[PDB]
Amino acid sequence: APVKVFGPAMSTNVARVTLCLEEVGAEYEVVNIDFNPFGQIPAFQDGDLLLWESRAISKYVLRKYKTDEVDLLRESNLEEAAMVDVWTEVDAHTYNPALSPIVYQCLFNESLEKLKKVLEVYEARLSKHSYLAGDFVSFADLNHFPYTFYFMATPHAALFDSYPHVKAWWDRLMARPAVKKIAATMVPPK
Amino acid sequence: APVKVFGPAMSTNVARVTLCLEEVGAEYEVVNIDFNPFGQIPAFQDGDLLLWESRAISKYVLRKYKTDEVDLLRESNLEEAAMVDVWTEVDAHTYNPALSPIVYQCLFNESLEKLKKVLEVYEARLSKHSYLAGDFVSFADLNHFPYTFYFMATPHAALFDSYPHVKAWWDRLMARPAVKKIAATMVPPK
Ligand SMILES: *c1ccc([N+](=O)[O-])c2nonc12
Ligand SMILES: *c1ccc([N+](=O)[O-])c2nonc12
């Protein structure tokens, strides 16, 4: 029975969730709604269950449809899950925040030094591991996709070229069937 | 072998972690440091493992020392863990943000209408369940402690009295041995 996502497709918070759904091979429809006790978007129906908060929706999607093949949270492995969480929280508290000003400015219209300084660190991390959480893809890696997608529409895309391990890491992420499927979806309704 | 927490005791981000440690009965020292690749506080050493980001540190503490008796994340139970995450994310994105202005203003020196509106919802939630994540305490409940602790030092403490289920829920939280032990610790060094 298909699970349902409500919100705009191109929305960073929706794409986080459509991505997780694609990654685990779930069946799902996306409904765009107009104008759940804060009245929040995205929302997500799994039959009787209603969820809001795209982190909780995603971690739910990744738990419901976990296989040995597709295990992107890694809760079975203590140190692994810790690193998934650490870099999830770095995406949320440091990375995403550096990109937003530049996406807002530089698509609908300072923070570039913070990101250079953040990229030095991601570059170090990614020189010692395939992926952020260690030598395996995880939610941490997937979390970076929405905000970074839009960053590469801007004329500051080329900055990743001073951070080769970050370029290669990103390219690798762009290469994934799921990631591509969603990237297509991130458009206004015409 | 004791795990180690670095940071100021009275810090909201440190207390989140000392609380989780107390709740699970772990052995731990707290070191206050001066002036981990963003150089972040709090930090946490488990022998060879170093963690930063207090959400990841806490979720780690709660996983390492999970018992059948003390299971505050509930990853074994799909819907349960979803609700733990949902209300964790509500504390982070809505609740905590309503309190900070009032703690900053009204201890070192508008947002009161947002919180009234947030409290209406918590009151509803808490009228239908013992605790936020359903009829069992969890990380979600514990997450609220630091920022709310300081809110009740202010002259707006009495506002919880218009939200009885939220008053009773809070009182219940204040009653816990762990919660009290930490509350004692949340003082400057004299
Ligand atoms: C994006 C990038 C650069 C500049 N610029 O003037 O250097 C811009 N101005 O408006 N958007 C952008
Ligand atoms: C806290 C609470 C109220 C007021 N007030 O003037 O109404 C304050 N002024 O500075 N701190 C507070």
Residue numbers in the entry:
A (entry chain AAA), B (entry chain AAA): 2 to 36, 50 to 119, 220 to 304
Copy out sentences from the published article reporting this entry, exactly as the authors wrote them.
In black-grass, upregulation of a phi (F)-class GST1 (AmGSTF1) has been shown to be a functional biomarker of MHR. Recombinant AmGSTF1 has been shown to exhibit both glutathione-S-transferase activity toward xenobiotics, as well as acting as a GPOX, reducing fatty-acid hydroperoxides to less reactive monohydroxy derivatives. The Phi (F) class GSTs, of which AmGSTF1 is an example, are found in all higher plants, being homodimeric enzymes in which each protomer of approximately 23–30 kDa with the catalytic serine residues located at the interface. Each protomer has two distinct domains; the N-terminal domain adopts the typical thioredoxin-fold, with the C-terminal domain being a bundle of at least five helices as demonstrated by the crystal structures of AmGSTF1 presented here.
To determine the structural basis of this covalent modification, AmGSTF1 was quantitatively alkylated with NBD-Cl as confirmed by mass spectrometric analysis prior to crystallisation (data not shown). The modified protein crystallised in the same hexagonal space group as the native form, diffracting to 2.8 Å, revealing a conformation that is almost identical in structure to the apo-protein, with rmsd of 0.2 Å for 188 Cα-atoms. The Cys120-NBD adduct was clearly visible in the unbiased electron density, even though the density and the refinement indicated only partial occupancy in the crystal. Although not directly associated with the active site, Cys120 is one of the last residues visible prior to the disordered loop projecting into the active site of the neighbouring polypeptide subunit. The alkylated residue points into the H-site of the symmetry-related protein.
